[PDB]
Each structure stands twice: as C-alpha cells, then as structure tokens.
C-alpha cells in the first residue's frame, strides 16, 4: 500500500539560504575596495554584497563577520559557496573562519499538473489554508506538522519554503498532494 | 422676528469657522510632514452635519459644549391633533420671554 | 464620487522622495563634525539640540555622545536642551 | 482620563470620520467600534498604527455585513497603503481568530451600475453574465471585479447605455487593459452569457472587439 | 559638487604637464596654475552641460566591479560601444561612475 | 564635427583663463606656449579554522591594470540587475578608445555577469 | 437662505493660504513652500439617500417617515487649489468638486420636487394634497421652527 | 574656542594613544598637518590661547595636562580615599579610566577590598 493514493510529481528544491561566522570583525570598505566582484554602500545597507559566478550565488558580509549565502540549489552548494566565500575573504588578508555554519532557509517548487477548487480548499482548511484573490493569486498554506509554508496557484503550481530540511518539503508535499487531488476541478 | 435662514446662517457661519480651522489643522499637519496635500482627507463633513442634527432635533441652539443656554427650545415637533391645530403650530409666535 | 488610489497619494509622493536618501548615515573616526562645531559656535555661544541635529546627519544618541565629549548643556532658563562648547 | 484610551478614543472619532465620508450605516460602524475595542483589549498588536487597524476593522465589517468595500475604496478614505491594511487585516484575523467570506460580483453590480445610472435590466443582465461566467470559470485568473466590470461593459455594450472602457475603468479603478484582457476572455461566450430575459440594443455579432 | 576627477585625463593631464612646464620655466606661479586648472574644471563641466549633445549605446559582459563613496568603478570585458558610424568593440573597458 | 567641438572647448578654456594669466602678471605668449605644447600632446574542510583547505577560487587581479582596457568616465543615471542580467543607464561621458578620444551625453547599457 | 445666504458665507471668507516652515539652513532651500485654496459656486443635489449597498436612491418624504430617516439632500461645492508655491511654478491651479454635506430640507421647498406635482400625483405618491408641510422631517419625526 | 577644543582633544588623544610626553603647539600643527594655520593665528594660539587656558601645565618649553595631573598610578587610591575626615575626595570613575586603565576589572577586585560605589 502506497503512503498516498496519488503520490509524486517530485517537488524539486530550488533555493537554499545559509549563514556562517568568519570568526572575526572585518572592514567592508577595505573588502569592497579589494574585491573584484562585490558591492557596498553604507547609505543603503551596512553589509557588503558579494557575488560569485560559480553557481551564481550571492553573499552578505556583515561587519560583525557573519555571512549569508544565497542562490544555492542545495545545502552543500550553500555550504560550498559559503566556504568558497570564507576563503577569499581570508585571502583578502583577514582571519576568516567557518565557525557556526547553518542552513537558514530552503525553497522548493512543483506542479500538481491539475487545477483545483481553491474555494473548497480555503473553506475546508481555513484553519491552515489561506487565500485572497484581491490580495495574491496564490493560496497560502501554512502547514505546522513540520512547520512548512506552501503557495498554491490556480494553475496547480506550488511553492514550499521556510524549510531547513529538504525531506520536510517532500513530507509537506506528500501530505498535501492527495488532498489537492481530492480537490480536482 | 427671527426666522430659520438668518439663524441657520449663524450656525453655518460658526461651523464653517469650525470647519475652516479643522482643515487648517490638517494644513498644519501638511506643513508638518511637508508631504503633498490632500483636500478630501482633511474634510470632516459630519461635524457640521451632526452639529445641525442636534440643533434641528432638540431645538437647542449652540455648540452644547459652550454657548447654548440662552437659546433653548428654538424648535419643536409638529402637532397633529387637528389640521387647524397643525396650522396653528405652523404659525405660532414666541418671544425671549423677557 | 472620488477615486480610491490604492495607496495615499501624498504618502506615495513621499515615497519617491523617501527612496532617494536615508538619515541612516555613517560615522567613523569622529572629526568632520567637531570642525563644523567650530563653525557654528563661532556665530553664537550656544545652540538648541534640534538645530545641532540639523547640521548633522547622524543619530542623536551618537550626537549626544559628541556634545558630551567637547561640551555640556543647559536649560538656558528655557528648559530646551541647549548645548555649548566648553569654556575650559 | 486614561491617557491609555486616548488613541483608541480618537480612533473611533476617526472611525466615525472614516465612516462619514461614504455614508455608512451605523450598525456596521458599531460592530467596527466593537471590533477595535476587542483588538485594543488584546494589546498584542499595540505595535501597530491605529488608523490602519480602524481601516481594517472597516473592511471586515463590510464583509461581516456581506457588503465588502474594496481596499481601493478603503484607501480613498485613509492614508494607509493597501499593503499595510492587508497586513493588519491578516493580523486581526489571527488576533481575533475569526473566519471571513469570499467576494461575489453582484454585491458591486448595484452601486457601480448606479454610478453609471444603468437601469436594473442591464444591471441584472450583467449579474447573470457574471454569474454564468464564474459558474463556468471562464476567467480563472482575473479579479472578479475586473471580470464584473467587463460583464458590465458587455452588458452596457448590449444596451443603449454604452460606455467607454476608460470611464468604466475609471469607476472600477482597474486598468483599461485588464478589462480589455478580461473582455477577451469573456467575449468568446458573449452571446450565450446573456440572460434569457434580455432585449438587445446591439447584436452580439456586432459587439466590439478589443 | 565639482568633479576634480576630470583633471585626471589626457585633456586634463596635457594641460597639467604644459602648466608644470610653465612652472619649471617659472613663467607662471603655482597659484596661477591652480586658478586656471580650477577654471578649466568649471569650463569643462559647462561644456558637458552645453556643447555635448550626442548619445551612445553600449553592450558588454561585466568582468569586475566596485562601489564606494557614491562612485562605481567597473571593468567590463568584450564590450561594444554602438554608434551609427564609429562602432567600437573592445576586449575590456574600465568604467568610473560618479554620482 | 566632433573634433571641431573639441577645439571650441580648447578656444573657450584658453580664452577664459587668459585674464587669470594676466592677474599673475604672466605674458600671453606663455599662454600660447601652453596651447601649443598642449595641441602637440594631443597627437574539503573539516574544521572551522583550516579555511585554506578551500584555496584559489579567486582569479588574477593583474588582469585589471595594463591599460588593456580603453578608459571611460561618466555619471550614471540608472543601474539595474537581475540575478545575472545587469542594466546600465548613463549620461555625460568621456571615452578614450584605442588612443582615440570620444564624448557622449547619454548612455544606456546591458550586461551579464 | 439656501439660494444665497449659505453662499454669501461661501462668498465671505473661505479662501485660505498656507506656507510651509522655512526650516532654515536646508542649504539652498530657496524659500519655504506655500499653498492656497479657492472656492466657487455651491451645489445641491435633490433629496436622496444612500442604501447600505453604498448606492444612492431618491429620498421620498413618505419613505423618510417609514424608515424614520431624516429628510435631507446632498450639498456640493466648486473648490479650487492654487499655488505660486513660492517657487518657480507660481500660478498652478487644481480644481475640486467636493461633497460637503447633506442638508435637511423644508417640506414644499423649491427643492422638494413634489411641489410641482398635482394632488393626483401626490395621492399617486400616497401624499396628502392638503399637507403643505413647511417643516422638516428628522429621523422620521416632524419638526417645526417656532418664531 | 573650537580649535582650542580640537587642540586639547588631540593632545588628549595622542597621549592616550601612547605619546605620554609633553608637547608643543608647533609639534601639534606639524603632526596634524595643519601647520598652515597662518603665523598670526599660530602665534595667537601659542601666546594667548595656551595662556587663557586655566589648567594648562607649563613643564618648561612644553605644555602638559590640566585634566589629570596625577601619574599613571593605576590601581590603589586607598591612602587618599580612606581619609573620612574629608571623606577622601575619592576619585571619579571617569578620572580613574583617564588615569590608566578601564575601571571594571580593577573594580570587581576592589569591590571586595577597599572601595564602595554610589550612583550619584
């Protein structure tokens, strides 16, 4: 017996957000100066914005030494870029480190490949499901099981985020797909 | 003999002074922010409107918060005991009772 | 009947202006502000804190740290937090 | 008296001053006053602008009376961005833990057609056109008001009381292209969407295209 | 605020070298060189606002970039400045953009 | 027409500083020497510290200083980016390409990174 | 009074101008901003009432009695917004036509459109032909001014 | 006044920074690259400003401190403090930091030794 009567349309993860501390305080002005591919403006934000073409990622370098890695398709790639970012900063002349690395966010998406009656869905699961066509064309499902948020669209497209574990996207989706099938137009 | 028109104009004159000042209070808010002006937002139509609702309903005459004492009972509900009674009501005359 | 502008017009107008510049500016190695202080206090011995805030482009608390550093302040017999350079 | 209530006290004057601008029934306003009082009593959202909450209370009461007014309309009487009203709205739904209702096109058929002084027959025809269109989900995307306006447009275009999209667009507030798109979506069924009790002023064949 | 940076150009430098010569030959005072350079600055700013009218279109992949004190400094590669007659492709170009 | 404009500036700048030259008591022939000299000039890791276990993703910076690049100086009107797609809106620019000198009043561009 | 007196007050002194603070030293501020407001003819709609759907309807004085509504009409005004602004853009004008209020009207007024209708019309309206009015209806209640 | 406040502040700053030795006006101008203040101003600063200062210390040909005259005594001000007959004039927390080192580390040990603090 399958776990669900409908199963798959594997929900593919599309984005990961992670942060790490370089273990030292830095001078972003110097960093901005030295870097060949970064931006900085204290009048706009207190951190340096650096990018690498590797996996087309972006980093946020706080003066505190904290950094943020974005754009990564996987936690490892986020870890890889963040590690790759940490090195260069060190290579600028700084005592950068890989202290306290952690995943901050993961983003997934998928298509159920069939349209569903949101009216019924927002009605039957108002406790969790949320939607407003005057607000945004996508229905917002805030699952608490694994504390996941889903975005459900009239075309059947779905987006999942707020995850720090990839399995949770699969899991949140495994719970919601059958229900959706039961809401087929 | 005092009639509705000169009397209403006095409230109209007073509430307009109230209305002019209230919009000016917005004008003060407008200069305060320096953000662009909004005419419709400053508007408080009800103030006069509801203010008039009091004078007209009770028969009282003033801002009730201040001047009104010397002008109570200007206006009353029509009497319908007979048509003639009604007509008498329509044509009755009163005084400041000294 | 009057059109609903989905956002307050003047607020929106405020937005075009607001996005241009912020008061959240930088302040490293205090020096340019004291030099400016000599310029202002050359015109009068004491000034109001808001007026001191006008020449500056920095948070008042940070500014408070500066005015404490080279000066003291008063009520000047007018309650107002008025600051002046140290006579000593 | 209680400095504490004075912003709340002023908010209900501002609620009244907000209900004043468009001649709202007092029963709606009273629930609204009660809604704020409740939201005030929670204080969990004290970190929020009172006027937005008042405006959000107002949007809710209209829905609670089964006659919602658009945020666009609600914006007309307030400084609060539609975004912040929506944001505050969500917070109140969460704050007061209460559900809401979905919108219907017919609820706005009345005043808009009124604002165009359109006769009930056109008004009612539009409502069917709208009603039939949504039952068939002919427009699974466009906002129902946008869909309604095009139906109204179609209806007005099916009567002598024709109006330009820009005027209608001006009344509804939606983009003139959005009606134009919504019209393109309803146009394939323009003839059959009309009610069986109708008297054309222009053949459906002669209905304009845009 | 006047842009001193435009003195760091061929136009600006050829002037400064010629002036420095005039200082080496002591035909002028250093103060005179400064006022003329200051005037040149004011003059070149004015010419940009007035005599200049032509516009140009450009295309080129970004190689490197930097930003500080409201001034951007880029270096793009495989760049192409586009003009109806003087089309110019370049392997690399350095771009300074003051506010 | 463009080289003519450059001359206009040459005439205008030289003439407009003439009086300053006088104020120094400097002879106008020296001014003519200035112009003459000038014209002639015209033509993996397993610990929070061994970061070096990730060495070398950065390339060589000496690519950026050999005057392989012709130079351009201009104010900017708008800069835009979309993940990897960049957009540029520029104005009032001085270009020096292949030793040649150019000028523009407005510039709009696009780039990927 | 309706015809002229309220208007004479509107004729009187509604124009107001306001100038922003100089906020001295905002470099080359130039001079502080300034705004002026101007008013023309005052307008009055026929007695009407707005139903909870937000839509308008005619205010039947018979309806006013039944629903206990206050017999009133909308009052409207020509408004102008006007500013040299103390800037280079002096004399730039902006026009408004603004709702100011709902005025309660005397029965058998010139604006009491029933005043032209026949007795037969009035009975068609279920109105009494020997009921000249001359007194307001407030919250459905009949109100007379005493001289 | 501002320049004098700037002179005092620099003198304070350079001394804290490590230059615990008497200075001169010229030496300050030089080090601050402000030498071109004009001989008139330079002179007026030297022989009137640093004369009207009520606490400036003439060591000889070099000006010294007015704020903290005491040496780098750092820890222990017990002998002065103990004097209950005059309370001890004790020291201000600002004065203590100025003296050599931050108070807190010394204070933590001092709080169980010989010193009590009031917030007044």
Contact of A129 with A122, CB cutoff 8 Å? yes
Rounded Cα distance between H89 and H81, Å, is 7
Cβ contact E65–A38 (<8 Å) = yes
All partners of chain F with 3 or more CB pairs under 8 angstroms: A, E
Rounded Cα distance between H25 and E56, Å, is 56
CA distance B66 to chain G (A): 22
Q: Given 3.40.50.20, 3.30.310.10, 3.40.50.300, 2.40.50.140, which CATH number is that of A6-17+104-185?
A: 3.30.310.10
Domain annotation for chain E: domains and CATH numbers: 1-53 (1.10.287.190), 54-99 (2.30.18.10)
C81 to each of A144, C23, C34, C72, how far by Cα in Å? 53, 22, 19, 10
Cα nearest neighbour of G99 on chain B? B45
Rounded Cα distance between G107 and G114, Å, is 9
How many CB atoms are located within 10 Å of the residue A72 CB? Answer: 25
Contact of A48 with A68, CB cutoff 8 Å? no
DSSP assignment letter at A51: E
How many CB atoms are located within 10 Å of the residue C47 CB? Answer: 20
Cα nearest neighbour of G20 on chain B? B31
Helices (H), D105-194: 106-115, 120-135, 144-157, 165-172, 176-186, 190-193
Q: Phi, psi at residue C82, to the nearest 5°?
A: -100, 135
Cα–Cα–Cα angle for A84, A86, A89, rounded to 5 degrees:
110
In CATH terms, the fold of domain C22-84 is Arc Repressor Mutant, subunit A (1.10.10)
Contact of A178 with A29, CB cutoff 8 Å? no
| Domain residue extents for chain C | 22-84
Residues 6+ apart with CB under 8 A from C33: C56, C58, C66
DSSP assignment letter at D4: G
Contact of H53 with H4, CB cutoff 8 Å? yes
Its CATH class, for the domain covering D2-99, is: mainly alpha
Residues 6+ apart with CB under 8 A from H63: H11, H22, H23, H24, H25, H50, H56, H57
Cα nearest neighbour of C31 on chain H? H6
Contact of E44 with E61, CB cutoff 8 Å? no
- Confirm whether A6-17+104-185 and A18-103 share one CATH topology: yes
Side-by-side strand order, sheet with G136-138: B75-77, G141-145, G136-138
Contact of G105 with G48, CB cutoff 8 Å? no
What is the dihedral sign for C-alpha G112, G114, G117, G119? negative
Q: Given 3.40.50.2300, 3.40.1160.10, 1.10.3720.10, 3.30.310.10, which CATH number is that of A18-103?
A: 3.30.310.10
Residues 6+ apart with CB under 8 A from F15: none
Rounded Cα distance between D154 and D175, Å, is 16
Beta strands A129-132; H57-58: pairing state: unpaired
Cβ contact A115–D103 (<8 Å) = no
Helices (H), chain H: 2-17, 25-32, 39-44, 50-52, 78-82, 93-99, 103-110
Helices (H), chain A: 28-34, 75-91, 118-124, 166-181
Would you list which residues of chain C are within 8 Å, Cβ to Cβ, of chain B? 2, 8-11, 13-14
SS3 A143: strand
The experimental method is cryo-EM
Q: Cα torsion for D17, D18, D20, D22, to the nearest 10°?
A: 160
CB < 8 Å to D84, chain A:
none
Rounded Cα distance between A16 and A79, Å, is 10
Rounded Cα distance between A41 and A45, Å, is 6
D171 to each of C3, D76, G50, how far by Cα in Å? 7, 13, 18
Among left, alpha and beta (phi > 0; psi -120 to 50; other), residue F101 is: beta
Rounded Cα distance between G98 and G77, Å, is 5
Contact of G59 with G65, CB cutoff 8 Å? no
Contact of A116 with F63, CB cutoff 8 Å? no
CB < 8 Å to C27, chain A:
none
Using a CB–CB cutoff of 8 Å, tell me whether D97 touches chain A. Answer: no
Best of G45, G52, G68 to substitute, by most chain D Cβ atoms within 10 angstroms, is G52
Residues 6+ apart with CB under 8 A from A163: A105, A106, A107, A108, A146, A148, A169, A172
CB < 8 Å to D25, chain G:
52
Q: Given 3.40.630.30, 1.10.472.10, 2.40.128.50, 3.40.50.720, which CATH number is that of D100-207?
A: 1.10.472.10
Nearest partner of H43 among H25, H63, H23, judged by Cα? H25
* Three-class SS of chain F: CHHHHHHHHHHHHHHHHHHHHHHHCCCHHHHHHHHHHHHHHHCCCCCCCCHHHHCCCCCCHHHHCCCCCEEEEEEEEEEEEECCEEEEEEEEEEEEECCEEEEEEEEEEEEEC
Nearest partner of G22 among G72, G86, G83, judged by Cα? G86
Nearest partner of A162 among A178, A151, A174, A175, judged by Cα? A151
Nearest partner of G103 among G127, G147, G65, G136, judged by Cα? G136
CB < 8 Å to A83, chain F:
44-45, 51, 54
Residues 6+ apart with CB under 8 A from F103: E52, E54, F2, F5, F93, F94, F95
Cα nearest neighbour of B4 on chain G? G145
């Amino acid at each position: 017996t399958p776990a669900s009567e409908s199963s798959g349309i594997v929900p593919q993860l599309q984005n990961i957000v992670s942060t790490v501390n370089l273990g030292c305080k830095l001078d972003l002005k110097t960093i901005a100066l030295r870097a060949r591919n970064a931006e900085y403006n204290p009048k706009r934000f207190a951190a340096v914005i650096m990018r690498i073409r590797e996996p087309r990622t972006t980093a946020l370098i706080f003066s505190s030494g904290k950094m943020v890695c974005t754009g990564a398709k996987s936690e490892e790639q986020s870890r890889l870029a963040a590690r790759k970012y940490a090195r260069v900063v060190q290579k600028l002349g700084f005592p950068a480190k890989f202290l306290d690395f952690k995943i901050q966010n993961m983003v997934g998406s998928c298509d159920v490949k069939f349209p569903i009656r949101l009216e019924g869905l927002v009605l039957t699961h108002q406790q969790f499901s949320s939607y407003e066509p005057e607000l945004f064309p996508g229905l917002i499902y805030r699952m608490i099981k694994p504390r996941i948020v889903l975005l459900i669209f009239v075309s059947g497209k779905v987006v999942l985020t707020g995850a720090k574990v990839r399995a949770e996207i699969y899991e949140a989706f495994e719970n919601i797909y059958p229900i959706l099938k039961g809401f087929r137009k | 003999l005092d009639l509705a028109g000169p009397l209403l104009a006095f409230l109209f004159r007073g509430m307009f002074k109230n209305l002019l000042k209230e919009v000016r209070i917005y004008a003060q808010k407008f200069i305060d922010r320096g953000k662009d002006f909004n005419l419709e937002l400053a508007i408080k139509t009800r103030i006069i409107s509801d203010g008039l609702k009091y004078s007209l309903a009770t028969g009282n005459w003033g801002d009730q918060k201040k001047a009104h004492q010397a002008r109570a009972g200007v206006s009353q509900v029509l009497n319908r005991l007979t048509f003639a009674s009604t007509l008498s009501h329509l044509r009755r005359l009163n005084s400041p009772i000294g | 009947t009057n059109y609903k502008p989905v956002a307050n017009h003047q607020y929106n107008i405020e937005y075009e202006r607001k996005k241009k510049e912020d008061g959240k500016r930088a302040r490293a190695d205090k020096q340019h502000v004291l030099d400016m202080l000599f310029s202002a206090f050359e015109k009068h011995q004491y000034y109001n804190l808001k007026d001191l805030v006008d020449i500056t482009k920095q948070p008042v608390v940070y500014l408070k740290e500066i005015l404490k550093e080279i000066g003291v302040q008063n009520v000047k017999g007018i309650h107002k937090n008025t600051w002046e350079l140290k006579p000593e | 008296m209680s400095s504490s209530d004075r912003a709340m006290m002023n908010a209900f004057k501002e609620i009244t001053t907000m209900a004043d601008r468009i001649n709202l029934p007092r029963n709606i306003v009273d629930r609204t006053n009660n809604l704020f009082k409740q939201v005030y009593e929670q204080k969990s959202l004290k970190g929020r602008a009172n006027d937005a909450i008042a405006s959000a209370c107002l949007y809710i009461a209209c829905r609670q009376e089964g006659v919602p007014r658009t945020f666009k309309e609600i914006c007309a009487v307030s400084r609060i961005s539609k975004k912040e009203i929506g944001r505050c709205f969500k917070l109140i739904l969460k704050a007061l833990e209460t559900s809401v209702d979905l919108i219907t096109t017919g609820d706005f058929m009345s005043r808009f057609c009124s604002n165009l002084c359109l006769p009930k027959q056109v008004q009612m025809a539009a409502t069917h056109i709208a009603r039939k269109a949504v039952e068939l989900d002919l427009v699974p995307g466009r906002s129902p008001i946008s869909v309604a306006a095009a139906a109204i447009y179609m209806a007005s275009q099916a009567s002598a009381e024709k109006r330009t999209q820009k005027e209608i667009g001006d009344i509804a507030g939606v983009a003139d292209v959005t009606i134009r798109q919504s019209y393109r979506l309803i146009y394939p069924r323009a003839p059959d969407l009309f009610p069986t009790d109708f008297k054309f002023d222009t053949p459906v064949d002669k209905l304009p295209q845009l | 605020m006047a842009y001193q940076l435009y003195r760091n150009t061929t136009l600006g430098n050829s002037l400064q070298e010629s002036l420095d010569e005039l200082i080496q030959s002591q035909q002028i005072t250093p103060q005179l060189a400064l006022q003329v350079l200051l005037q040149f600055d004011k003059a070149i700013n004015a010419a940009l606002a007035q005599r200049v009218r032509n516009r140009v279109n450009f295309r080129g992949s970004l190689n490197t970039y930097r930003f500080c004190d409201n001034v951007w400094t880029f270096v793009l590669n495989d760049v192409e400045f586009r003009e109806v007659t003087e089309l110019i492709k370049v392997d690399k170009v350095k771009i300074v953009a003051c506010d | 027409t463009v080289p003519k404009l450059y001359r206009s500036v040459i005439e205008d700048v030289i003439n407009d500083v003439r009086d300053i030259f006088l104020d120094d008591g400097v002879d106008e022939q020296v001014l003519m020497e200035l112009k003459t000299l000038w014209e002639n000039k015209l033509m993996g890791q397993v610990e929070e510290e061994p970061l070096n276990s990730e060495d070398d993703v950065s390339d060589e910076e000496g690519q950026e200083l050999f005057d392989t690049e012709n130079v351009v100086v201009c104010q900017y009107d708008k800069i835009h980016r979309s993940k990897n797609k960049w957009k540029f809106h520029l104005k009032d620019g001085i270009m020096n390409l292949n030793g040649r000198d150019y000028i523009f009043s407005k510039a709009i561009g696009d780039a990927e990174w | 009074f309706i015809q002229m007196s309220v208007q004479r007050i509107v004729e009187d002194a509604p124009p107001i101008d306001l100038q922003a603070e100089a906020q001295h030293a905002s470099g080359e501020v130039e001079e502080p901003p300034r705004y002026l407001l101007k008013f023309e003819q005052i307008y009055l709609s026929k007695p009407t009432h707005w139903e909870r759907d937000g839509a308008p309807s005619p205010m039947m004085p018979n309806e006013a009695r039944l629903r206990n509504l206050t017999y009133s009409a909308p009052l409207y005004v020509d408004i102008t917004k006007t500013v040299i602004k103390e800037g280079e853009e002096q004399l730039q004008t902006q026009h408004q036509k603004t709702f100011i209020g709902k005025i309660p009207i005397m029965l058998r007024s010139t604006y009491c459109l029933l005043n032209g209708l026949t007795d037969r019309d009035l009975c068609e309206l279920n109105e009494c032909p020997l009921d000249p009015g001359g007194y307001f209806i407030i919250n459905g209640s009949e109100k007379v001014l005493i001289a | 006044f501002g320049v004098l406040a700037k002179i005092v502040n620099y003198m304070k700053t350079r001394h804290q920074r490590g230059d615990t030795h008497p200075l001169t006006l010229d030496e300050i101008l030089d080090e601050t690259q402000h030498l071109d203040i004009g001989l008139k101003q330079k002179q007026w600063l030297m022989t009137e400003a640093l004369v009207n200062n009520p606490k400036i210390e003439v060591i000889d040909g070099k000006y010294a401190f007015k704020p903290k005259y005491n040496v780098r005594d750092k820890k222990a001000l017990l002998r002065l403090l103990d004097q209950h007959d005059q309370r001890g004039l004790g020291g201000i927390l600002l004065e203590d930091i100025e003296e050599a080192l931050p108070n807190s580390q010394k204070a933590v040990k001092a709080l169980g030794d010989q010193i009590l603090f009031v917030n007044r």
